[PDB]
Structure formats: C-alpha cells, structure tokens
Design a protein around this nucleic acid. Sequence first.
DNA 1: TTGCATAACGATGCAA
DNA 2: TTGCATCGTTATGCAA
DNA 3: TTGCATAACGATGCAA
DNA 4: TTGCATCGTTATGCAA
DNA 5: TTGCATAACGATGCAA
DNA 6: TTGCATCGTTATGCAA
Lengths: 149, 154, 155, 149, 155, 149
Amino acid sequence: AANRAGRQARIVAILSSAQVRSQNELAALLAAEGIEVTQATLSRDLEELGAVKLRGADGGTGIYVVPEVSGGTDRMARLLGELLVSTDDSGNLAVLRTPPGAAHYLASAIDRAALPQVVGTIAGDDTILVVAREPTTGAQLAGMFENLR
Amino acid sequence: NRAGRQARIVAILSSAQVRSQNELAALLAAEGIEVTQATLSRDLEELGAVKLRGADGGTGIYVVPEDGSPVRGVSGGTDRMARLLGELLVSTDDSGNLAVLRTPPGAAHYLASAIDRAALPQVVGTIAGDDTILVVAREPTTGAQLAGMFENLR
Amino acid sequence: ANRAGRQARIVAILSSAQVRSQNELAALLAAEGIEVTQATLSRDLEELGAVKLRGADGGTGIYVVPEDGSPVRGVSGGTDRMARLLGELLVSTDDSGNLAVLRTPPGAAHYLASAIDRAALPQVVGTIAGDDTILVVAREPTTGAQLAGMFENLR
Amino acid sequence: AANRAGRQARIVAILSSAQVRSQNELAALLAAEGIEVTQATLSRDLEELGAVKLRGADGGTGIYVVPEVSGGTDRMARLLGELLVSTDDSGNLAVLRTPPGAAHYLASAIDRAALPQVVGTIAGDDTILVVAREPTTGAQLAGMFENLR
Amino acid sequence: ANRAGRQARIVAILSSAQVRSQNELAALLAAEGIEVTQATLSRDLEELGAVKLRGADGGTGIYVVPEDGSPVRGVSGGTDRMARLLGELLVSTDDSGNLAVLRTPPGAAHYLASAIDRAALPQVVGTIAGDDTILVVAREPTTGAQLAGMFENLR
Amino acid sequence: AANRAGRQARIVAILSSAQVRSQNELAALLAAEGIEVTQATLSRDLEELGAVKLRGADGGTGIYVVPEVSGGTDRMARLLGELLVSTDDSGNLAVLRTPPGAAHYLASAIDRAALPQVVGTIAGDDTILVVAREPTTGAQLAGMFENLR
DNA sequence: TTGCATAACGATGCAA
DNA sequence: TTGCATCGTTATGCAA
DNA sequence: TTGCATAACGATGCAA
DNA sequence: TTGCATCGTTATGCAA
DNA sequence: TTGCATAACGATGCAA
DNA sequence: TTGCATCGTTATGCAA
Ligand SMILES: NC(=[NH2+])NCCC[C@H](N)C(=O)O
Ligand SMILES: NC(=[NH2+])NCCC[C@H](N)C(=O)O
Ligand SMILES: NC(=[NH2+])NCCC[C@H](N)C(=O)O
Ligand SMILES: NC(=[NH2+])NCCC[C@H](N)C(=O)O
Ligand SMILES: NC(=[NH2+])NCCC[C@H](N)C(=O)O
Ligand SMILES: NC(=[NH2+])NCCC[C@H](N)C(=O)O
C-alpha cells in the first residue's frame, strides 16, 4: 500500500528497467511488489508523469517511457519476508541464503533500497554476498536484515 | 461412458487394493465393464491416480487423492507454480513451439525453477534468462497453447 | 495520391494541426479530398513512427512524427544504442526455424541482448543470453533467417 | 563406491534437487558423482525409501519424490580432483579457479559438504569465492582445498 | 571403384604425395584413371576428415588425414572431451521441433554446453545453458530428435 | 592499434576462447577490442602462427586453432572507459558498477589483464567484486581503476 | 547386498 | 475414444 | 484520490 | 494495400 | 608490414 | 551420389 507519489516513483523505476507495452503489464509489475491499483489509476499516473508510449519508424506498438534512496526499503523488507532463508557473516560480509533461483531477485531489491551501510551485493543462485561499508561489519548487516525480516 | 467408468474406478480404488492396471481391468469386468489396460492407463493418468506405498512398502496400490494431498509429499509442485505465476508472470507471448514468459527483472530463474518442479507433461524444458523464460512445448502442443495455459494462472 | 503520397499529406497535416485521434486525422484527410479508414491510418502512423505526445499532466497526446531529431528527452535511440552495440559486438549470425542465433565475444552476450530487448523490435518475441550466444525468437511470420539478416545488416 | 545407506542419502538429495522421471535417469545422476549401481538396486533403494512416482490430475508419467552435513565431502573431493585449477586467498576469502562454466558445479558440491569453516560460496563462471568462518582465514581454506585435492 | 573405394585411393594418394588443393587431387586421381569433380572431393575430404596442415610460417597447407592418431599438438579431442563429459553429465535428452534439450545434474549445464560448443558440431547452430538444462538448436534439415539421439548415443 | 606481435598474441587468446570459423569472424572479434585489420593481414597472421582450420571426420567446415600477463591491460582500460560506472570499496574488496549485463564482460577483461594486486573477480549482472591481494586494499584497487579509466 | 536376466507392468503411435 | 501391438520402465528369482 | 463500468481509441487476421 | 469487423488497450464520468 | 583488389580455393542447393 | 554453377572463404601481387 503506497500513495500516489510513492507509486509513481516506483512506476518511473519500473519503466526504465523493463519494456512495458501496456498498462495491464505495468499493473502486474507493480503487483509483484505488492502495489495493487487498477488500470484507470495507471492511466492517470502515466499522464501525470508525462509518460509516452514510444516507438520509432516501423516500430510496432510502443513501450512506455518517461522522458529525461528510492524507498524502496519496503519492497525489500517485503521480499526479505518472503525469500530470506538464513543470514550469516564474516568480517565485512553478510551472507544471505534464499531459495534456489531467488538470489538475483532479492539482491536487486537490496540494491534498489540503497542502504548507506551496504557497499554492494553479488548474487549467485541461492546465495548473496552483501558488502558492509566500513566500519559496519557483516554481523551488523546480518542483524539489520534479521530485524527488517 | 468414460466419466462414468472413471467413477467406477474412483470407487473400486478407495475400497479395494489395486496393485496393477490389469487387476483393475478384471475388477471392472466382474462389475460388467470391459476396457483394456491402455484405457485404464489413460483414465488413471486423467484421474491423477498414483501408486502408493510407505517406507519398505513394496509395489504400491493405486489411490486417487481427493485434493487432500499425498501424505507428506506436496503435490503442490503445481500449487506453488500457480502461486508464483500469480505473483510474477507479467506477460506471455509465443512463437512456434516456444512460449515466452516475462517476469520482473531478476525473477525469471525463481519462476522457471517452480515451473520445472511442477513437471508439466506438455513442457519439454525451460531456460531462464533474467526477466525472460523460454518454455519449450512438447509436440503437438504449440507455444501458443502453452502460453495460454500459463496466462490462465497469471 | 498513392500511399507514399498520403503519408506526405499526413506528415504535413500533423506538423501544422493538433491531431488527437486517428478518426480525427481521417476527417482531416477527407476534407482535403483523401478517403482512408482508421485501419490504414494506424498502419501509416506505424510506418511513419508517429507517436502520441504530451508532457507532464498533458492529457491525451497529439500525434507527431520526429524528423530524426529525437523525442524530447526520451532517447528513441533504444535502436541507435542497439545498432552501436551490434556494430561493436555482433561476431556472427546464424538461424534455424523461428530462431536467430547471434554470437558475441565471450562474456558479452548479456550486454548485447539487453540492448536488443530495450529496442523492443516488433519482430522479436524475446531473447535469451548465455555467455557468448544469444537466441532471438522471431515473431511469426518472420523467420529466424530474416531476423538474422536484419541483425547482420547492422553488424 | 558407497554403501546402501550412503547411496540412499544421496538419492534423497538428488530427488529434491532434480526432476527424476526414471530409474535409468537416477542412475545417470548417481554416476555423475561416481556412484555406479544398476536399476535393480535403485528399484530396491526407492522402495526402502518409500519413494513414490508422483503426478497430479492430467499430470503425465510422474517424477520420483520421497515424502516428508551430508557426507557429502567425498562428492566434493571427487570434483575438486577434477575441476580445481588453482586456489589463492586474501583475508577471509579463498579464491578458487575452475575451467570455464565449471564454477557453479564445483561450488554447489562445496555447499552440500557443509564445511563448518565455510560461511558460504559464490560462483561466477570460472571462479568461486569461498567465505571463511572466523577466525579461519582464506589461506587456511585454500590449504584445506589443496589438501582434499 | 565406388565411393568407399575412391576414398581409399585418396587416403593413399595423400599420405604419399603433397596435395595442396582439391583440383590438384582431381588431376592426380585422373592420372590413376578416376574422374571426379572438385565438389565430390570436397565431400570426401569432409567425410575423411582431411585437414590442410602446415606448421608455423608454413604457407598454404597440404591435405592429411589423421589415423585416429591426433593432429600435432592441437587436440581434435574437442569431440573426445565432449563425449567424455556427455558420458559423465548427460542425464536425459528430449526434443521438440528443431530443439534438443539435454538435462544434466544441477549446476553442470554450462560446463557441458561449453564442451559441446568447442566440439563445433556441423549439425548444431548453437547452444544455451541454463542451470540443469541445455537447449541445442539443430541446423536444418537435422531435427531436434536426430540431434538428441546423436547425444543419447554418447550418454 | 597494436603491432604484428601484440595482435597475434590476442589472436591466440581469441582462438582458444571462441569457435572461430572464418577470418571475417576473427576480424569482428578483434574489432570488439578496438583492433582493426583486414582479412589479408589475418591470413598472414594465421599462417605465421601455424593456425590450422581443424575438423574431424564428418566434421563440417572447421574452426581455427593454433597447436600446443597478456597485455592485455589495454583491452581492459578500453573497456573501463566504456563500462565503468562507479567504484567503491570495503576492506580488501573493490566494488565496481557497470551497466546492466556488462559485468561479466568487464570482469573477464580484468581477469585477462592478470594484475599482480588482484586475486580474483566475481561478476554478477551490473556489479563486480574485485579481491585485492594483501596488503593492497580495495580502496587502492578502486584508485587503480579510477586511474586507468 | 548386489548384479543379471528376465518377467511384469505401464505408456503410447497408429488405425479404426 | 478405444484397442492393438509394442516399447520403455520397474520388479524380482537366483547365483555369488 | 480511487475504483468501476464503460466509452473512445488503436491494432490486426482475414478476405478481397 | 486496403477495408471490414473485431478485439485489446487507454481514457474518463460518477459514486464514494 | 599493411591494404587493396583480385585470384585461387572450397562448399553447397539444386537437379539429375 | 554426383556434377554444375555459384557463392563464400582464403591467399597473394603490387603500391605505399
Ligand atoms: N545450481 C548452482 N548454480 N549451484 C551453485 C551454488 C553456488 C553458490 N552458493 C552460488 O549461489 O553462487
Ligand atoms: N540484466 C540483464 N542481464 N538484462 C538483459 C536481459 C536479456 C535477456 N532478456 C535475458 O533475459 O537473457
Ligand atoms: N563460459 C561458459 N559458460 N561457456 C559456455 C557457453 C555455452 C553456451 N554457448 C552459452 O553461451 O550459454
Ligand atoms: N565468460 C565470462 N563471463 N568470463 C568472466 C569471468 C569473470 C569472473 N571471474 C567470474 O567468474 O564471474
Ligand atoms: N535453480 C534452479 N534449480 N533452477 C531450475 C530452473 C532453471 C531453468 N531450467 C534453467 O536452466 O535456466
Ligand atoms: N538483474 C539482477 N539479477 N539483479 C540482481 C543482481 C544484483 C547484484 N548487484 C548483482 O549484480 O549480482
């Protein structure tokens, strides 16, 4: 559940990372992070945003683009609830376990939250390395994920 | 007819201990009905009959679940796939024997893995990239039929 | 007074009036003598690359055709960027049935494939990148060979 | 070469990570980690395990599932023999090189061995990062892999 | 004096003379009586596995057919290595249309697929590896089923 | 722009990592790292190298192979110019950001440069972890990449 | 216990 | 939709 | 602001 | 190449 | 040494 | 299975 402004920020973010051909598709992309709105609302959002359905010559039907921290943290905490199997740490690294295939998904949500204490993440398949920004330790990071769980 | 023979079968199974299809044939014959092993294989396949046994339990006997599950093994490979399709299938498209499923960025592997686990008879295999999954349809299913099958769970 | 001529009438009408719907462009062309249905306008605008434009809070757009000078701040160089990376990274092409197979230097397939996706080609249903190989699925009735030749001609 | 009990533990592990449609297929999966048995033996294993060939309605032919450290270390040492090109280290990380494409394969075998001194692994393509559990260092880890080689 | 016999003449002529071109092998076979065009020689050399060899700074090669004893230092065991890993890692095969689908243990698909690419099979247009699955695209008119059976027979 | 000898070393490297079926293809692979030569030159290179177009029985048309630090650093610096969005660090790790999909590409170029202070790299999608060799820190590595940029 | 050889069982392309 | 014929898959008697 | 119901608008398979 | 018929996609009047 | 233009060489769809 | 005709691929004479 997010307000007009929060939802639109997410829309802008979605439109840059995905090729969105229709408003129904945009609604599915938002529902994946727990934002449920109808098509009417998205028509209004995209208009307020100045989003245009852009295509070149012989370019088919078009995809929406809007011309020119994220918060953000809620998407992540949502996914942590769902995909975080375990945490552990060593030195400046937290190590997170997710179900198989889920690591890139969780890690991308972590990146987008832009935590001040996270230098970066790398996802394999069911594992994520989270690099702690000094002097934060991996143990503290792990503590932060266990708390936001 | 068919739907009626299958009712005879659901009934015979949950009241006797059938260990082979030929055995179910002779049982249905005594009750009047004449079908071959071929047809029983087809019916049990449609019914979702499974040959069951516990640890050291020998050759199983056929049982059809009543949407109440198998003992501890979740036949919700399918239920889990449907749930993740509901959460993550963004759109579908197709070409020839291929269905192409789109997901949010980074989620394709997670969905594709749930699809593999469900072991659909009409899927030969899947490949996940980052936001795209290619699903190969088993002849004579087309990519379009397979896509619509995934759409109807979206 | 054929197609290429009607499309010149259209480029002209658009950049001098404010057309908000295809039916509206139909009646405009009718006054100027020409009779075409909405179907045909949809096809022409698609070929012209006409886009319905508006700014922030700008309502229902009006049609405009770029003159290879871009859209305002949104780079219609999804295609230009794809062509540049094809130039840099497409090593060879091949095909089978509905599939084009593109080869790149080792490790570059994801980076190229991502630029192809962003370009959102009408004839591409999707792509999958491995490490040095990209599979591109052609939209019927385009064949993998036509799609490969299309990528070759940018190589 | 493993005994009835070791082989069956491996079978249970295989059945959860793969979709196994036939006993011949199960034999190939076991041969990949150097366990060679015949189909007769697998029929007997699967029976002792209570494994059932499960399918839903209109669900085709079925895949085997059994209802409800791994050792483990031998699978890994086997693969180390085969895929370990070099080791190196820095701080709390061992860095392992494998031939191209082999890294996920080796790393998954390392994960399943559940070494008490390994917090986790991440595989790229020909490289694996192994995170040492404090106070073990990466150098020691590298020493441990060079020993099990 | 059929195909298998002409190819024996060729294995013989090659390992006793220095043939630098197919036309050259044609005239050599003509002197020995046999009449074939360059087209046919190209086909035979292809089947024989004749390779045009030279060392460093060695110019235009001469044709040689290995006797299952390898090429000098370059392992023609791209194929041997693929067969070995197929034996180790191919768990099952299946097919659809122009695609063979190979299954491996979890995490091994890239390692197998890489060995298959290196072998550079004439009937493979390319491969894509996921985690436990590899998709192999058959070159028309080979089908996915033929390609799968070819991998099966090495399993 | 590289000399006969530098170009040929790159050729040898390319022929082992790719399946090269034709000289035109080899030219595209070299152009991707900014080396532009014609087919005539490559015919001469491959001859000097003793490269042969190798195939087995019924083996089709053949691929080129040559029988039996890289510098190297220039390929990398070129790509750094093009793909390095940002650098950051923690302890013994430098963290590099590239555009999406570009990480494996940049990282492989980093591996091939074989920098004495780099123990190894792992690439995700838009991120690379670079492991610094003790006592070099990640901050210094980051400084080195910011310099070669 | 295990392999082998083989029997019992189940699935499926084809034609009706 | 079914049966036939057949083939792939799984179970099991005996030797070791 | 939002959802709903529905109207307005655009795209496309088919047949000519 | 176009129009027809139709369907998918997007915009918007009203109740809350 | 390199590029260019072009010659020599090899591969392949098609029809017999 | 082959030859024809042709095209893609590789080698090389000359200018710079
Ligand atoms: N199926 C696999 N790729 N397994 C390898 C896992 C290795 C490591 N834990 C990672 O997630 O990167
Ligand atoms: N972050 C990325 N790699 N994006 C590119 C995606 C390319 C292609 N659609 C795939 O899924 O394989
Ligand atoms: N380094 C590797 N993973 N090589 C394997 C490549 C296999 C296949 N061509 C792909 O690109 O997916
Ligand atoms: N084919 C490649 N992507 N090679 C680059 C490997 C880069 C890095 N060492 C990794 O394994 O992730
Ligand atoms: N982590 C997994 N087990 N993924 C399984 C599904 C992935 C899909 N078959 C692929 O190879 O890309
Ligand atoms: N598109 C994605 N898979 N994003 C998740 C990966 C995020 C992480 N920084 C990495 O590159 O591994």
